[PDB]
Amino acid sequence: AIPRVAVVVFILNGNSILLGRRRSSIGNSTFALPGGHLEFGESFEECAAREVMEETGLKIEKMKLLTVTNNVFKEAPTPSHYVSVSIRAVLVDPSQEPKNMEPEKCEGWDWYDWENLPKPLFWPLEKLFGSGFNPFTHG
Amino acid sequence: AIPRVAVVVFILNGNSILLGRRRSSIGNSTFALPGGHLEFGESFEECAAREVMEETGLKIEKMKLLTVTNNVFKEAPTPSHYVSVSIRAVLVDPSQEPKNMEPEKCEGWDWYDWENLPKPLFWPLEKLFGSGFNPFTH
Ligand SMILES: [Mg+2]
Ligand SMILES: [Mg+2]
Ligand SMILES: [Mg+2]
Ligand SMILES: [Mg+2]
Ligand SMILES: [Mg+2]
Ligand SMILES: [Mg+2]
Ligand SMILES: [N+]
16 A cells, blocks of 8 residues: 555636535545546646546646645545645636536536535545635645 | 655755765766655655654654655656655754765765755756745745
């Protein structure tokens, strides 16, 4: 069991970010960002765009590094440890509608306003926001 | 292969940081930070303190997250991909001096002034500095 790298993406659209409820052994039914495992040789930005495309169909651009978090799930059915690298991005076409391209892993994607975020948030996301982190203004 | 997580540590002492020349198949003889592989279940801060202790004997405190870099070495004898999390720290005892605890991996550790850094820096470190990154003010 070793720590595994994931990239997670804050897609900023107006005052909103894209979230979707997980269908997963970890954080089931909680609202989370699009994202996934970093592949060998891939950059953070390449991973962000690929994962967003694979999961939502959305085309993003202007990717920027935000932060990194350490997320240990010792009590999961398969104990897991993720190191999650967060990336900010925007839509190439702000009118583009999300699709649920991996519908066995997510209930669906929707936009949520920064001042009216849904609950329950996936714990790594809630914990990060609890530190005061704001993807619109960070860095 | 798969990307592997390392934690690397900027130990700030006055205007200086700790660096040591690698003995390695990647970046041999270049100046690098103390650090190493994150273990399962470990926090970034726990890893930083453990790796610094194992490599230098130094006791550090006040750890703080700085940034993360993606470092691919496709050309290495064994192709490697590291995701490096940088941590800032200071010495518990400012008078403590490092020891070369793992001479198989490093020639030794010394303090280098921010305005007079040595060369060659290990490429991930040189590339990070090339972006304007400064561990004292970040
Ligand atoms: Mg994945
Ligand atoms: Mg994947
Ligand atoms: Mg995917
Ligand atoms: Mg190591
Ligand atoms: Mg090690
Ligand atoms: Mg060691
Ligand atoms: N995660």
